[model samples]
Target: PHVGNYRLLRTIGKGNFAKVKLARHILTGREVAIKIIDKTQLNPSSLQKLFREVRIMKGLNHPNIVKLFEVIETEKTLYLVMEYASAGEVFDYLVSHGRMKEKEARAKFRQIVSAVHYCHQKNIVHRDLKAENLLLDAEANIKIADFGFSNEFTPPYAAPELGPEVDIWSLGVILYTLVSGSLPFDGHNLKELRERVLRGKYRVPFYMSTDCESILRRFLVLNPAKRCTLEQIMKDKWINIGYEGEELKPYTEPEEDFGDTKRIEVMVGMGYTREEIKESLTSQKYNEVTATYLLLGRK
Candidate 1:
């Protein structure tokens, strides 16, 4: 059956209870992933958490960040219509390809830092930043899917405490993994990682450049207050490599304006009144009509 103006298709992703469908807008034929979460499986506390996630997900709009196009609520299922990252996770790439060379890793890291900085500027903190959260799209550019990373070789990317600096610490771990194919403070479990993290004794590979080592050290600072912020990370020499010609890629792009008269007229043809659709999009509320507006208003 259809969800709003979108036609549901095959399953593309599966969380514990959330199953993603490869769907498309019937009106514009734009592809969008439908994340269907079974709310019946959630406890009261977890339900609240999911709502919190929904609120956070809606406000975030960035090129590197996955777009949440719409939301659909039912008694048993919570449907999140979102951007489909066709290329999958960076974790898989890291696992398959092993360590990325300095040049490749630096380019990817620049994009990652830009996304993190945008989130931080909005007063949002991603306590979980790992290769798993860094997803690649069809064109190979990163579309960060977050509020979450690893497998058999998992190393904790989380910092000791859940704070803004914790994100920086996680990034350090990610960068280490990028260039070294290993954690900077790796251990089999929390106990071992705790001791190692507190001891503040992690090493960069001998083959690594001095700049890589310096950035890793800056990010993994034991003192949370002193951990590198996104601002500093963006300005680092290693992260800024080859800055001369490429487009100033990042969150500089403007946020979407839902006021396109053409799309609004289309929704009106499909049965929603102009006033109702316009106000819903103005408030950016998530409902069937607004979902239709967003799905039809796809730009």
Candidate 2:
């Protein structure tokens, strides 16, 4: 089927109010996703909300934020042409891999933070930040998706006004899920979930280093006023450790004398070069599983 100058290829996703279809620009042959919203079903307020979301998305221009090409409003529906991510949602990865290692989680989390920081700088707040809303490009980089619940902040997180701390709270939840493979807060129903979040009670696992625990604590505080700002997170030691290299390692002793012949041979057999294996092993504290994960780019 065709809508305007785009031809619908297949349904990629759906929500209560809209259906998203993979489509191609007829003239350019470029692929895009179009979100079709049935206007006939929306009252004035709902329609206004949809317009607001579209406006917010249109104004955003970040590599990690999904791009909105154009909007088409007809008597019966509203069509939103958007950038398409062929690799799909980060939520799908978490579902299949159970949990991501610390390095991988930190790498992706940095991208998310950068994107959110940019939005806040533009006075925008994404109230609904979650794994499902974070899409991945073919290279597995994060592309923040969906602005349906986004708005200028109004309440608990913002004083007399606006802020992006609400998104920070959501980021904390997502970070926890990335490393722990589960939500920090959970409940059988929305009511319970709200209670859990409000109470701000959650435990960081023992396996996570003290630095990870500290960062999570700062981000998940009940009082948004006390919550860690994006600037603080960027400056945190553990968050930047992956990029800082050996200088950030906990210990600085003489090179270990332990033989890594077996480990090196195994990693080489798995398609990693000797140099790559050595670097991975050195960076990951000589743990075979961690080194393999660093080399393979998988959980």
Candidate maximizing lDDT? 1
RMSD of each: 4.1, 15.3
lDDT tens digits by residue: candidate 2, 113-185: 8788777776777776765678888788888887444422112221111257778878888888888877776
The CA lDDT of each predicted structure is 0.75, 0.68
List model 1 lDDT by residue over 31-58, tens digit each. Answer: 8888787878777887776787678788
RMSD of 2: 15.3
Error of 2 at 267 (Å): 48
- What is the Cα-based TM-score of model 1? 0.81
Model 1 C-alpha RMSD to native: 4.1
Q: Which stretches of candidate 2 lie over 4 Å from their true place?
A: 148-162, 190-195, 245-299
